[PDB]
Design a protein around this ligand. Sequence first.
Ligand SMILES: CCCCCCCC/C=C\CCCCCCCCCCCCCC(=O)N[C@@H](COP(=O)([O-])OCC[N+](C)(C)C)[C@H](O)/C=C/CCCCCCCCCCCCC
Lengths: 104, 274
Amino acid sequence: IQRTPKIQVYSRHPAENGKSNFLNCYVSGFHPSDIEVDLLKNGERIEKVEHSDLSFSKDWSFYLLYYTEFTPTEKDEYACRVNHVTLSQPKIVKWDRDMGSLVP
Amino acid sequence: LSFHVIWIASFYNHSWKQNLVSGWLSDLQTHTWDSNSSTIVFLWPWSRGNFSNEEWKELETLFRIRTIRSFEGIRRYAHELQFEYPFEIQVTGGCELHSGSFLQLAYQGSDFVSFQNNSWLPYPVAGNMAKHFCKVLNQNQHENDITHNLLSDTCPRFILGLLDAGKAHLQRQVKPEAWLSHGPSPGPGHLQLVCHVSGFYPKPVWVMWMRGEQEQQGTQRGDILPSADGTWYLRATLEVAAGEAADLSCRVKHSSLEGQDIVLYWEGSLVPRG
Ligand SMILES: CCCCCCCC/C=C\CCCCCCCCCCCCCC(=O)N[C@@H](COP(=O)([O-])OCC[N+](C)(C)C)[C@H](O)/C=C/CCCCCCCCCCCCC
C-alpha cells in the first residue's frame, strides 16, 4: 500500500524583507521512501537545498525536512514542489506569508 | 524515551539496493551510518558516550557483517518469501532504562515480524510469509542470543554513558518567538487568523487564541514541525467573522518563559486600523 506525502511549508522567523531567514518544507506520511522535493523561488529551483536524514514514524510512514537559508524581498514568492509515485504530477505548495497592508 | 536505532533497506531490484541506518536518543538523532566507509558517524561529541575507541570498531564490524548477511539473505529467500521487487524493509530496535526493549521489522510499510525475548515472532496479520521469514531469522539460536544481548545488555549500557553525558542537551531551554499572519483559506465573510510559534525547545508548548482571559475554543493547533536547528514550530489558527477579530490575541506558554507568556495582538495593519 502506498501513502501520499503531506507537505507543509514554513519559515523559521517572521518574514522581514532583506533579513536572512530559513525556508522549510516538511514532507511526511509517505510510502515508499523515494521522493523528489525542490524548493522554488519565483517558480525556479533553488540550488543546494539541505535535508534531514530520512526517518519514519511509528506507523512506518517516512518523513524528511528540506530547508535553505534565504533572504526574501517584497517581489519574491517561494514554494515547495514534491513528486512521489502517488502523484500524477508534482504538487506545489506555496509559502504563505503576509505582504502587510495592501491599499495605501 | 531512551535509545533506538532505525534501519531503512530499499530493495529496488535484485541487483540494486540502498541502506540507511541512524541512532536516536529520545527524539534526537545521535548517530548515522556511512555505508560507503562502513563507519558509525557521531553527530554530537557526546554521542560516543564513555565507550572506548576500540569498542566502537567491534560494533562497526558486527553492524557491517550483519548488514551484508542481511541483504544477501533477503535476496536469497526473496522468492521463497514472495518478496516482489521493489520492496522496502524497515527495522526499529532499542531500549529504555530505569525499563524495556523492542525490535520490530516491517515489510512494505506494515508490521511484519518482531523479536520477543529470544526469538523472532510473526505478527498474526502478516500471514504465512511472516512465519516463513521467522524460520530464516531463527535459523541460528546463537545469533538470536546476540540480538537479545544487544537489546537487554548493550543498549541500556549505552544510555548509561549517554543520557548523563548529554542530558545537558535534552534539558536545555530555548525560548520561542511568535508572530501573526492572515490565513489563506477563510470561508466567505470570515477570516483565518494564524499564530506562528517558532524556535522553542523542549517540545511541550501551549498556544491559544484568546479574547482577554477567555480561551477561544475554535483554536486549531497544527502538528509540531521540526526546524533545521533542532527547535520546533507550530501554527495555531482561528476562524472568525470579519470585524469580530477585534480584541483577539495569541498567547504562548512554554517552560523556558518562566511564566512570562508571549502575548501578541491582532492589531495594526493586520486589522487594518485607520
Ligand atoms: C547507527 C548507530 C548505532 C549505534 C548503536 C549503539 C548502541 C546499540 C544499542 C542497541 C542496538 C540494537 C540493534 C539491534 C540490531 C538487530 C539485529 C537483527 C539482525 C539479525 C541479522 C542476522 C545476523 C547474521 O549474521 N545473519 C546471517 C548469519 O546466519 P548463519 O546461519 O549463516 O550463521 C552463521 C554461522 N557461521 C558459520 C558461524 C558463520 C544470515 O545470513 C542471516 C540472514 C537474515 C536475513 C534477514 C535479514 C534480517 C533483517 C534485519 C536487519 C537489521 C539490521 C540492524 C542494523 C540497524
